[PDB]
Amino acid sequence: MKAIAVKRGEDRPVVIEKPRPEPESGEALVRTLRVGVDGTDHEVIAGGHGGFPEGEDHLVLGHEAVGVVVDPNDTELEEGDIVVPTVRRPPASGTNEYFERDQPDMAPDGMYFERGIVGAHGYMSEFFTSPEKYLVRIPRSQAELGFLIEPISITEKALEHAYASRSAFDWDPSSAFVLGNGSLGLLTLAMLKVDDKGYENLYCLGRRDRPDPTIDIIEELDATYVDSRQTPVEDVPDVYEQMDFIYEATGFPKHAIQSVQALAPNGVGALLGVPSDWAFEVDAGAFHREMVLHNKALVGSVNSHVEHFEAATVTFTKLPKWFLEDLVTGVHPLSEFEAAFDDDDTTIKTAIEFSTV
Amino acid sequence: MKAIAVKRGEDRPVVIEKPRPEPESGEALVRTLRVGVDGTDHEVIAGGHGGFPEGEDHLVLGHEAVGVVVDPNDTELEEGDIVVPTVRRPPASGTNEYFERDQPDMAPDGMYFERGIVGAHGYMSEFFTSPEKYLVRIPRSQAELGFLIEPISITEKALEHAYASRSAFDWDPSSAFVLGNGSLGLLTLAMLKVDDKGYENLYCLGRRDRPDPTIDIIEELDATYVDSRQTPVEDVPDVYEQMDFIYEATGFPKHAIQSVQALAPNGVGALLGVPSDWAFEVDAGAFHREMVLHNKALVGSVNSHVEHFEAATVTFTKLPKWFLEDLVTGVHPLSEFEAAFDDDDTTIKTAIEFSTV
Ligand SMILES: NC(=O)C1=CN([C@@H]2O[C@H](COP(=O)(O)OP(=O)(O)OC[C@H]3O[C@@H](n4cnc5c(N)ncnc54)[C@H](OP(=O)(O)O)[C@@H]3O)[C@@H](O)[C@H]2O)C=CC1
Ligand SMILES: NC(=O)C1=CN([C@@H]2O[C@H](COP(=O)(O)OP(=O)(O)OC[C@H]3O[C@@H](n4cnc5c(N)ncnc54)[C@H](OP(=O)(O)O)[C@@H]3O)[C@@H](O)[C@H]2O)C=CC1
Ligand SMILES: [Zn+2]
Ligand SMILES: [Zn+2]
């Protein structure tokens, strides 16, 4: 079978061949339909070759997959089922409490593999296998954009934990502010528009010049574009209003600190960004006091699990068609896959199509 | 009646006289039994005279009161009821959503008064009044140490919010680390010992040399004393273990930052400290990434309300007698009240006795 991979010492994704996998007990064989490209794929391609599987020359890319079950094997799935795989699998040493308790998304460093990211091949091959417990059935009509279910699920989990932080009181948020205009930020912005919390005012932070398709999406969702070069996060309460909810998706460390200042009393920041170490001058006293005197929270979140993938299917149905059309800037056949790894301002979410149903 | 107050331009608490208050509709008249002294009382005495009531020459001190109802007026309380007052009352402009929804503890700055702290006289007078809704009945045998109910309630709320942050998954903490060996830290340490979470290992951070009565309390509770001069917060995972729960009660801004590093994956820090602005070099990138990759939370908490005072009475019953004996270093009759404002290492929790039942 064909697969798209990064090889050791190389700086580009390429087509390789490897045998079609065979499902072990409790696993189904899946024919890959479409796989989304993400920042993490770009990070692997950049020179992050520490994530390769034990004793292997390459890493198959892609962790945002949708496929069709072609061999249900000894599982309870049926042939023809449209499924999305979860990302996390047990590490080398085998299972642990996180996997046993059906919460591998809460497993710490070294206690999981992530397919297409660290320790395990991804989904950008014509076929893959997975335990039935990690295959989430989705509605058949979500096959076309099914590669979106995984990133939606990231937000489903983050919101679940952030909202849990506020559950000891009657929290009544009216404003939400997404930091970041990548596909995650933009997905989250549309999600917050359909959120039960009934947000009145939505904002999204970026740093683009017009004309820009992320600005257009933000504005078409009836949200305010906040150009950080004009109005930084801490200035936002002056220029706009205090934000009950902040969802951080920039990976900018200053935003973790400054979100505390931009928050309304009793608000929560969800942090999703993954920055490298970076030291600079912080008014920790103001950070600390503001958290306390105004009963604020910061909640970090990573990965997601089955419940979040199921929630994502419901959320998907509520997402506007125009939005899905504009968010997905290109689906590329495997024949011309290289275009999927385009990275520029007009490129929002791409995917590679391996087959059709 | 007699009261203990700070007057404008003066640097010491003194006895004053003012008329006995008369209960308005919905209020009871209370005879003050005992009032605890806290750090906030010391801060008022220091030169924080911005908290005085509108157009008044003095602030009556004390916010940790226990008393006996002597006139139930038109309320549902009975004469002889032992009660503890909540601290927060409506601001000048009158009621608001926080007060209306029975959550004034979540009111932001300027939207409340705190009796004995800002905008309203405290409880260090022979008599006081309060709405029945802010008077919490407690068991009669808690009259002697009833001034402890308010600070216990501070922790009851903080734990409620911190634990709420962890409620989206099956959190199974085994370790807890209290930062601070003031009366709040020590109360919290004994509370975490009787907490349903069933903590296996307890730690408390201080910076005292032996012999010291706070060290003795920590060790007698079967907790580990962590001298920050030896093992700072960030070093604690090396020397000891990663902490599932951290309760910050130092008011040291570095501890807000460093608690993130000392936390176990999926852990939460409660912040209670109130520092002034203080800027210094922080590795914000490491702070940010650690929050996210390891699904951690920070939750700030201030004040408390009726539900927390009720919970505090239950917790009180579970507290060891030796602990209560050792925690309360002096109860001083009003006649010799000055000793209550002693502030040294052997002084833990003091109170002033205005009357007996
Ligand atoms: N915790 C988790 O499970 C997950 C975490 N992530 C992380 O979340 C973050 C967002 O993911 P994704 O949206 O896909 O990644 P992107 O890098 O594509 O999105 C980040 C966006 O933030 C913008 N940005 C960065 N700094 C600033 C700033 N100072 N002011 C205004 N805008 C800024 C960038 O704008 P510009 O292009 O103009 O520079 C970019 O469009 C990343 O750090 C990623 O690592 C992603 C997926 C899951
Ligand atoms: N949010 C809320 O509702 C409430 C907040 N507070 C706040 O919580 C904090 C604790 O209250 P309380 O216990 O009564 O106050 P204390 O000041 O009496 O307690 C703080 C303790 O922390 C210790 N400490 C300070 N810095 C360090 C450090 N670097 N290393 C080790 N120990 C340190 C001090 O030790 P030492 O004496 O040796 O210097 C002191 O014993 C205060 O900041 C207070 O303002 C208090 C009540 C309610
Ligand atoms: Zn993804
Ligand atoms: Zn108190």
Side-chain angles (χ1 to χ4, degrees), chain B residues 20 27-31 33 67-83 127 132 135 137-138 140 357:
Chain B
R20 186 189 295 199
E27 301 184 332
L29 181 68
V30 184
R31 180 169 41 86
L33 293 165
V68 57
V69 178
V70 293
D71 184 8
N73 199 21
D74 60 350
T75 73
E76 272 174 290
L77 301 159
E78 294 181 297
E79 196 184 9
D81 275 351
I82 312 303
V83 295
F127 297 85
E132 71 182 309
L135 297 172
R137 286 173 294 236
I138 71 178
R140 188 161 222 102
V357 164

PDB file of all heavy atoms in Angstrom, chain B residues 20 27-31 33 67-83 127 132 135 137-138 140 357:
ATOM      1  N   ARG B  20     -25.145  50.978  71.064  1.00  0.00           N
ATOM      2  CA  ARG B  20     -25.517  49.618  70.696  1.00  0.00           C
ATOM      3  C   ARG B  20     -26.416  49.691  69.456  1.00  0.00           C
ATOM      4  O   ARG B  20     -27.363  50.487  69.427  1.00  0.00           O
ATOM      5  CB  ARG B  20     -26.226  48.944  71.873  1.00  0.00           C
ATOM      6  CG  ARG B  20     -26.553  47.470  71.713  1.00  0.00           C
ATOM      7  CD  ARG B  20     -27.451  46.994  72.861  1.00  0.00           C
ATOM      8  NE  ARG B  20     -26.777  47.063  74.161  1.00  0.00           N
ATOM      9  CZ  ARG B  20     -27.164  46.399  75.253  1.00  0.00           C
ATOM     10  NH1 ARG B  20     -28.226  45.600  75.206  1.00  0.00           N
ATOM     11  NH2 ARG B  20     -26.476  46.517  76.390  1.00  0.00           N
ATOM     12  N   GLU B  27     -33.200  41.673  60.376  1.00  0.00           N
ATOM     13  CA  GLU B  27     -31.947  41.544  61.122  1.00  0.00           C
ATOM     14  C   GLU B  27     -32.156  41.045  62.545  1.00  0.00           C
ATOM     15  O   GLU B  27     -33.165  41.344  63.170  1.00  0.00           O
ATOM     16  CB  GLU B  27     -31.205  42.882  61.185  1.00  0.00           C
ATOM     17  CG  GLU B  27     -30.840  43.485  59.840  1.00  0.00           C
ATOM     18  CD  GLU B  27     -30.044  44.748  60.011  1.00  0.00           C
ATOM     19  OE1 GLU B  27     -30.226  45.416  61.043  1.00  0.00           O
ATOM     20  OE2 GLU B  27     -29.228  45.073  59.136  1.00  0.00           O
ATOM     21  N   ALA B  28     -31.183  40.302  63.066  1.00  0.00           N
ATOM     22  CA  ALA B  28     -31.142  39.962  64.485  1.00  0.00           C
ATOM     23  C   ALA B  28     -30.083  40.801  65.197  1.00  0.00           C
ATOM     24  O   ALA B  28     -29.104  41.256  64.573  1.00  0.00           O
ATOM     25  CB  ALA B  28     -30.846  38.481  64.667  1.00  0.00           C
ATOM     26  N   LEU B  29     -30.288  41.018  66.494  1.00  0.00           N
ATOM     27  CA  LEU B  29     -29.256  41.598  67.346  1.00  0.00           C
ATOM     28  C   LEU B  29     -28.459  40.470  67.987  1.00  0.00           C
ATOM     29  O   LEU B  29     -29.036  39.550  68.576  1.00  0.00           O
ATOM     30  CB  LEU B  29     -29.846  42.513  68.444  1.00  0.00           C
ATOM     31  CG  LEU B  29     -28.805  43.189  69.366  1.00  0.00           C
ATOM     32  CD1 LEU B  29     -27.947  44.250  68.610  1.00  0.00           C
ATOM     33  CD2 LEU B  29     -29.445  43.774  70.638  1.00  0.00           C
ATOM     34  N   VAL B  30     -27.133  40.568  67.898  1.00  0.00           N
ATOM     35  CA  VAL B  30     -26.243  39.518  68.396  1.00  0.00           C
ATOM     36  C   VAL B  30     -25.319  40.059  69.475  1.00  0.00           C
ATOM     37  O   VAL B  30     -24.712  41.135  69.307  1.00  0.00           O
ATOM     38  CB  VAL B  30     -25.390  38.900  67.228  1.00  0.00           C
ATOM     39  CG1 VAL B  30     -24.524  37.747  67.714  1.00  0.00           C
ATOM     40  CG2 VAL B  30     -26.292  38.425  66.091  1.00  0.00           C
ATOM     41  N   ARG B  31     -25.198  39.307  70.569  1.00  0.00           N
ATOM     42  CA  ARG B  31     -24.144  39.564  71.541  1.00  0.00           C
ATOM     43  C   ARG B  31     -22.870  38.805  71.160  1.00  0.00           C
ATOM     44  O   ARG B  31     -22.837  37.576  71.181  1.00  0.00           O
ATOM     45  CB  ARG B  31     -24.566  39.229  72.978  1.00  0.00           C
ATOM     46  CG  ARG B  31     -23.445  39.512  73.992  1.00  0.00           C
ATOM     47  CD  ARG B  31     -23.872  39.462  75.453  1.00  0.00           C
ATOM     48  NE  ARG B  31     -24.799  38.376  75.790  1.00  0.00           N
ATOM     49  CZ  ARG B  31     -24.456  37.129  76.113  1.00  0.00           C
ATOM     50  NH1 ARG B  31     -23.194  36.739  76.113  1.00  0.00           N
ATOM     51  NH2 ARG B  31     -25.394  36.257  76.430  1.00  0.00           N
ATOM     52  N   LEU B  33     -19.475  36.992  71.219  1.00  0.00           N
ATOM     53  CA  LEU B  33     -18.807  36.094  72.146  1.00  0.00           C
ATOM     54  C   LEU B  33     -17.300  36.263  71.982  1.00  0.00           C
ATOM     55  O   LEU B  33     -16.638  36.804  72.868  1.00  0.00           O
ATOM     56  CB  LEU B  33     -19.269  34.628  71.931  1.00  0.00           C
ATOM     57  CG  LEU B  33     -20.741  34.349  72.280  1.00  0.00           C
ATOM     58  CD1 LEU B  33     -21.224  33.002  71.694  1.00  0.00           C
ATOM     59  CD2 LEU B  33     -20.937  34.388  73.801  1.00  0.00           C
ATOM     60  N   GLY B  67     -21.213  34.639  67.914  1.00  0.00           N
ATOM     61  CA  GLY B  67     -22.033  35.323  68.899  1.00  0.00           C
ATOM     62  C   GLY B  67     -23.308  34.559  69.218  1.00  0.00           C
ATOM     63  O   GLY B  67     -23.560  33.484  68.660  1.00  0.00           O
ATOM     64  N   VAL B  68     -24.084  35.109  70.144  1.00  0.00           N
ATOM     65  CA  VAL B  68     -25.383  34.556  70.553  1.00  0.00           C
ATOM     66  C   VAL B  68     -26.495  35.583  70.237  1.00  0.00           C
ATOM     67  O   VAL B  68     -26.365  36.782  70.534  1.00  0.00           O
ATOM     68  CB  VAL B  68     -25.374  34.093  72.044  1.00  0.00           C
ATOM     69  CG1 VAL B  68     -24.989  35.225  72.981  1.00  0.00           C
ATOM     70  CG2 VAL B  68     -26.724  33.441  72.468  1.00  0.00           C
ATOM     71  N   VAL B  69     -27.547  35.113  69.568  1.00  0.00           N
ATOM     72  CA  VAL B  69     -28.701  35.940  69.221  1.00  0.00           C
ATOM     73  C   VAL B  69     -29.397  36.328  70.525  1.00  0.00           C
ATOM     74  O   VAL B  69     -29.750  35.454  71.337  1.00  0.00           O
ATOM     75  CB  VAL B  69     -29.710  35.171  68.301  1.00  0.00           C
ATOM     76  CG1 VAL B  69     -30.957  36.038  67.992  1.00  0.00           C
ATOM     77  CG2 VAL B  69     -29.027  34.716  67.007  1.00  0.00           C
ATOM     78  N   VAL B  70     -29.573  37.632  70.728  1.00  0.00           N
ATOM     79  CA  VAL B  70     -30.235  38.149  71.947  1.00  0.00           C
ATOM     80  C   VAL B  70     -31.573  38.809  71.624  1.00  0.00           C
ATOM     81  O   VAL B  70     -32.437  38.943  72.491  1.00  0.00           O
ATOM     82  CB  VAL B  70     -29.327  39.116  72.774  1.00  0.00           C
ATOM     83  CG1 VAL B  70     -28.143  38.358  73.376  1.00  0.00           C
ATOM     84  CG2 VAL B  70     -28.877  40.307  71.940  1.00  0.00           C
ATOM     85  N   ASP B  71     -31.723  39.228  70.377  1.00  0.00           N
ATOM     86  CA  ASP B  71     -32.998  39.689  69.855  1.00  0.00           C
ATOM     87  C   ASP B  71     -33.205  39.176  68.432  1.00  0.00           C
ATOM     88  O   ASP B  71     -32.678  39.744  67.474  1.00  0.00           O
ATOM     89  CB  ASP B  71     -33.124  41.218  69.901  1.00  0.00           C
ATOM     90  CG  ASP B  71     -34.515  41.710  69.449  1.00  0.00           C
ATOM     91  OD1 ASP B  71     -35.427  40.874  69.238  1.00  0.00           O
ATOM     92  OD2 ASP B  71     -34.694  42.935  69.306  1.00  0.00           O
ATOM     93  N   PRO B  72     -34.011  38.109  68.285  1.00  0.00           N
ATOM     94  CA  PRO B  72     -34.307  37.578  66.951  1.00  0.00           C
ATOM     95  C   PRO B  72     -35.160  38.517  66.095  1.00  0.00           C
ATOM     96  O   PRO B  72     -35.308  38.276  64.903  1.00  0.00           O
ATOM     97  CB  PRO B  72     -35.036  36.254  67.234  1.00  0.00           C
ATOM     98  CG  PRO B  72     -35.540  36.358  68.604  1.00  0.00           C
ATOM     99  CD  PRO B  72     -34.669  37.341  69.358  1.00  0.00           C
ATOM    100  N   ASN B  73     -35.691  39.588  66.690  1.00  0.00           N
ATOM    101  CA  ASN B  73     -36.469  40.582  65.946  1.00  0.00           C
ATOM    102  C   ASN B  73     -37.581  39.888  65.136  1.00  0.00           C
ATOM    103  O   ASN B  73     -38.271  39.023  65.673  1.00  0.00           O
ATOM    104  CB  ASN B  73     -35.528  41.432  65.069  1.00  0.00           C
ATOM    105  CG  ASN B  73     -36.146  42.751  64.634  1.00  0.00           C
ATOM    106  OD1 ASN B  73     -37.099  43.240  65.250  1.00  0.00           O
ATOM    107  ND2 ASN B  73     -35.592  43.343  63.572  1.00  0.00           N
ATOM    108  N   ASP B  74     -37.732  40.236  63.859  1.00  0.00           N
ATOM    109  CA  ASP B  74     -38.724  39.603  62.984  1.00  0.00           C
ATOM    110  C   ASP B  74     -38.170  38.439  62.120  1.00  0.00           C
ATOM    111  O   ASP B  74     -38.749  38.084  61.089  1.00  0.00           O
ATOM    112  CB  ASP B  74     -39.462  40.665  62.131  1.00  0.00           C
ATOM    113  CG  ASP B  74     -38.530  41.486  61.220  1.00  0.00           C
ATOM    114  OD1 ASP B  74     -37.279  41.399  61.353  1.00  0.00           O
ATOM    115  OD2 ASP B  74     -39.072  42.229  60.346  1.00  0.00           O
ATOM    116  N   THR B  75     -37.055  37.845  62.559  1.00  0.00           N
ATOM    117  CA  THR B  75     -36.376  36.784  61.795  1.00  0.00           C
ATOM    118  C   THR B  75     -36.818  35.408  62.273  1.00  0.00           C
ATOM    119  O   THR B  75     -37.561  35.295  63.246  1.00  0.00           O
ATOM    120  CB  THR B  75     -34.846  36.833  61.953  1.00  0.00           C
ATOM    121  OG1 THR B  75     -34.494  36.381  63.268  1.00  0.00           O
ATOM    122  CG2 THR B  75     -34.296  38.232  61.711  1.00  0.00           C
ATOM    123  N   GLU B  76     -36.332  34.363  61.607  1.00  0.00           N
ATOM    124  CA  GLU B  76     -36.633  32.994  62.021  1.00  0.00           C
ATOM    125  C   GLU B  76     -35.633  32.380  63.000  1.00  0.00           C
ATOM    126  O   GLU B  76     -35.756  31.207  63.358  1.00  0.00           O
ATOM    127  CB  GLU B  76     -36.827  32.089  60.806  1.00  0.00           C
ATOM    128  CG  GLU B  76     -38.257  32.077  60.285  1.00  0.00           C
ATOM    129  CD  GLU B  76     -38.377  31.289  59.001  1.00  0.00           C
ATOM    130  OE1 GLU B  76     -37.872  31.765  57.959  1.00  0.00           O
ATOM    131  OE2 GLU B  76     -38.970  30.187  59.032  1.00  0.00           O
ATOM    132  N   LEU B  77     -34.665  33.177  63.448  1.00  0.00           N
ATOM    133  CA  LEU B  77     -33.732  32.755  64.490  1.00  0.00           C
ATOM    134  C   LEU B  77     -34.423  32.786  65.855  1.00  0.00           C
ATOM    135  O   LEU B  77     -35.483  33.378  66.002  1.00  0.00           O
ATOM    136  CB  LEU B  77     -32.466  33.637  64.480  1.00  0.00           C
ATOM    137  CG  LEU B  77     -31.684  33.636  63.150  1.00  0.00           C
ATOM    138  CD1 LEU B  77     -30.778  34.859  62.991  1.00  0.00           C
ATOM    139  CD2 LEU B  77     -30.883  32.333  62.961  1.00  0.00           C
ATOM    140  N   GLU B  78     -33.830  32.131  66.843  1.00  0.00           N
ATOM    141  CA  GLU B  78     -34.374  32.102  68.197  1.00  0.00           C
ATOM    142  C   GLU B  78     -33.353  32.745  69.127  1.00  0.00           C
ATOM    143  O   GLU B  78     -32.139  32.730  68.831  1.00  0.00           O
ATOM    144  CB  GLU B  78     -34.663  30.648  68.625  1.00  0.00           C
ATOM    145  CG  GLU B  78     -35.791  29.980  67.800  1.00  0.00           C
ATOM    146  CD  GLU B  78     -36.110  28.540  68.228  1.00  0.00           C
ATOM    147  OE1 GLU B  78     -35.230  27.680  68.121  1.00  0.00           O
ATOM    148  OE2 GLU B  78     -37.266  28.260  68.634  1.00  0.00           O
ATOM    149  N   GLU B  79     -33.829  33.306  70.243  1.00  0.00           N
ATOM    150  CA  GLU B  79     -32.919  33.812  71.277  1.00  0.00           C
ATOM    151  C   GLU B  79     -32.122  32.628  71.799  1.00  0.00           C
ATOM    152  O   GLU B  79     -32.673  31.550  72.029  1.00  0.00           O
ATOM    153  CB  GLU B  79     -33.658  34.530  72.421  1.00  0.00           C
ATOM    154  CG  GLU B  79     -32.728  35.399  73.290  1.00  0.00           C
ATOM    155  CD  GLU B  79     -33.412  36.056  74.498  1.00  0.00           C
ATOM    156  OE1 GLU B  79     -34.584  35.710  74.793  1.00  0.00           O
ATOM    157  OE2 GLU B  79     -32.765  36.920  75.161  1.00  0.00           O
ATOM    158  N   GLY B  80     -30.816  32.818  71.949  1.00  0.00           N
ATOM    159  CA  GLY B  80     -29.948  31.758  72.433  1.00  0.00           C
ATOM    160  C   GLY B  80     -29.212  31.028  71.327  1.00  0.00           C
ATOM    161  O   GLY B  80     -28.288  30.265  71.599  1.00  0.00           O
ATOM    162  N   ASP B  81     -29.610  31.261  70.079  1.00  0.00           N
ATOM    163  CA  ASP B  81     -28.924  30.669  68.931  1.00  0.00           C
ATOM    164  C   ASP B  81     -27.458  31.137  68.851  1.00  0.00           C
ATOM    165  O   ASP B  81     -27.191  32.343  68.941  1.00  0.00           O
ATOM    166  CB  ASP B  81     -29.620  31.075  67.644  1.00  0.00           C
ATOM    167  CG  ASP B  81     -30.794  30.175  67.287  1.00  0.00           C
ATOM    168  OD1 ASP B  81     -30.971  29.119  67.945  1.00  0.00           O
ATOM    169  OD2 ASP B  81     -31.513  30.537  66.328  1.00  0.00           O
ATOM    170  N   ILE B  82     -26.530  30.185  68.694  1.00  0.00           N
ATOM    171  CA  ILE B  82     -25.116  30.511  68.420  1.00  0.00           C
ATOM    172  C   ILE B  82     -24.986  30.701  66.917  1.00  0.00           C
ATOM    173  O   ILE B  82     -25.383  29.828  66.127  1.00  0.00           O
ATOM    174  CB  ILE B  82     -24.135  29.428  68.954  1.00  0.00           C
ATOM    175  CG1 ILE B  82     -24.455  29.026  70.413  1.00  0.00           C
ATOM    176  CG2 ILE B  82     -22.657  29.891  68.802  1.00  0.00           C
ATOM    177  CD1 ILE B  82     -24.456  30.184  71.479  1.00  0.00           C
ATOM    178  N   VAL B  83     -24.481  31.858  66.507  1.00  0.00           N
ATOM    179  CA  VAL B  83     -24.373  32.180  65.086  1.00  0.00           C
ATOM    180  C   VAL B  83     -22.992  32.713  64.686  1.00  0.00           C
ATOM    181  O   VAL B  83     -22.293  33.336  65.485  1.00  0.00           O
ATOM    182  CB  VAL B  83     -25.488  33.184  64.612  1.00  0.00           C
ATOM    183  CG1 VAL B  83     -26.879  32.537  64.726  1.00  0.00           C
ATOM    184  CG2 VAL B  83     -25.433  34.502  65.424  1.00  0.00           C
ATOM    185  N   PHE B 127     -21.935  44.152  70.806  1.00  0.00           N
ATOM    186  CA  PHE B 127     -23.138  43.782  70.062  1.00  0.00           C
ATOM    187  C   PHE B 127     -22.953  44.128  68.589  1.00  0.00           C
ATOM    188  O   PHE B 127     -22.224  45.063  68.247  1.00  0.00           O
ATOM    189  CB  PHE B 127     -24.396  44.492  70.620  1.00  0.00           C
ATOM    190  CG  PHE B 127     -24.724  44.118  72.037  1.00  0.00           C
ATOM    191  CD1 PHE B 127     -24.110  44.774  73.113  1.00  0.00           C
ATOM    192  CD2 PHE B 127     -25.617  43.079  72.303  1.00  0.00           C
ATOM    193  CE1 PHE B 127     -24.386  44.409  74.427  1.00  0.00           C
ATOM    194  CE2 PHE B 127     -25.912  42.710  73.623  1.00  0.00           C
ATOM    195  CZ  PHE B 127     -25.300  43.372  74.690  1.00  0.00           C
ATOM    196  N   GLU B 132     -30.637  38.034  58.864  1.00  0.00           N
ATOM    197  CA  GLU B 132     -30.686  36.617  59.213  1.00  0.00           C
ATOM    198  C   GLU B 132     -30.063  35.728  58.127  1.00  0.00           C
ATOM    199  O   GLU B 132     -29.522  34.662  58.428  1.00  0.00           O
ATOM    200  CB  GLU B 132     -32.116  36.154  59.546  1.00  0.00           C
ATOM    201  CG  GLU B 132     -33.071  36.081  58.341  1.00  0.00           C
ATOM    202  CD  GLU B 132     -34.501  35.659  58.705  1.00  0.00           C
ATOM    203  OE1 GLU B 132     -34.673  34.625  59.389  1.00  0.00           O
ATOM    204  OE2 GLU B 132     -35.448  36.379  58.294  1.00  0.00           O
ATOM    205  N   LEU B 135     -26.424  35.225  58.892  1.00  0.00           N
ATOM    206  CA  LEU B 135     -26.109  34.624  60.184  1.00  0.00           C
ATOM    207  C   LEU B 135     -26.266  33.120  60.059  1.00  0.00           C
ATOM    208  O   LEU B 135     -27.345  32.627  59.733  1.00  0.00           O
ATOM    209  CB  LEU B 135     -26.976  35.184  61.321  1.00  0.00           C
ATOM    210  CG  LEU B 135     -26.817  36.677  61.618  1.00  0.00           C
ATOM    211  CD1 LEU B 135     -27.864  37.169  62.617  1.00  0.00           C
ATOM    212  CD2 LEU B 135     -25.371  37.015  62.085  1.00  0.00           C
ATOM    213  N   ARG B 137     -26.280  29.558  61.804  1.00  0.00           N
ATOM    214  CA  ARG B 137     -26.361  28.866  63.072  1.00  0.00           C
ATOM    215  C   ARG B 137     -25.339  27.755  63.088  1.00  0.00           C
ATOM    216  O   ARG B 137     -25.125  27.086  62.087  1.00  0.00           O
ATOM    217  CB  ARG B 137     -27.755  28.272  63.319  1.00  0.00           C
ATOM    218  CG  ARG B 137     -28.837  29.278  63.681  1.00  0.00           C
ATOM    219  CD  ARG B 137     -30.209  28.584  63.743  1.00  0.00           C
ATOM    220  NE  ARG B 137     -30.608  28.098  62.419  1.00  0.00           N
ATOM    221  CZ  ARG B 137     -31.741  28.416  61.805  1.00  0.00           C
ATOM    222  NH1 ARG B 137     -32.611  29.218  62.394  1.00  0.00           N
ATOM    223  NH2 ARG B 137     -32.006  27.928  60.603  1.00  0.00           N
ATOM    224  N   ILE B 138     -24.709  27.566  64.235  1.00  0.00           N
ATOM    225  CA  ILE B 138     -23.693  26.544  64.373  1.00  0.00           C
ATOM    226  C   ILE B 138     -24.069  25.827  65.641  1.00  0.00           C
ATOM    227  O   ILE B 138     -24.857  26.372  66.445  1.00  0.00           O
ATOM    228  CB  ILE B 138     -22.224  27.130  64.481  1.00  0.00           C
ATOM    229  CG1 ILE B 138     -21.984  27.835  65.833  1.00  0.00           C
ATOM    230  CG2 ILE B 138     -21.880  28.027  63.271  1.00  0.00           C
ATOM    231  CD1 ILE B 138     -20.504  28.397  66.000  1.00  0.00           C
ATOM    232  N   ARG B 140     -24.082  24.545  69.376  1.00  0.00           N
ATOM    233  CA  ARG B 140     -23.819  25.321  70.588  1.00  0.00           C
ATOM    234  C   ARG B 140     -22.420  25.096  71.171  1.00  0.00           C
ATOM    235  O   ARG B 140     -21.779  26.039  71.636  1.00  0.00           O
ATOM    236  CB  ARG B 140     -24.919  25.061  71.648  1.00  0.00           C
ATOM    237  CG  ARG B 140     -24.819  25.966  72.861  1.00  0.00           C
ATOM    238  CD  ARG B 140     -26.115  26.049  73.674  1.00  0.00           C
ATOM    239  NE  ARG B 140     -26.390  27.433  74.089  1.00  0.00           N
ATOM    240  CZ  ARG B 140     -27.278  28.226  73.489  1.00  0.00           C
ATOM    241  NH1 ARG B 140     -27.991  27.771  72.455  1.00  0.00           N
ATOM    242  NH2 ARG B 140     -27.460  29.474  73.917  1.00  0.00           N
ATOM    243  N   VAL B 357     -21.409  32.690  77.038  1.00  0.00           N
ATOM    244  CA  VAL B 357     -22.825  32.403  76.786  1.00  0.00           C
ATOM    245  C   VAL B 357     -23.637  32.582  78.077  1.00  0.00           C
ATOM    246  O   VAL B 357     -23.294  32.025  79.124  1.00  0.00           O
ATOM    247  CB  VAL B 357     -23.042  31.012  76.137  1.00  0.00           C
ATOM    248  CG1 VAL B 357     -24.490  30.587  76.247  1.00  0.00           C
ATOM    249  CG2 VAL B 357     -22.642  31.059  74.668  1.00  0.00           C
TER     250      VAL B 357
END
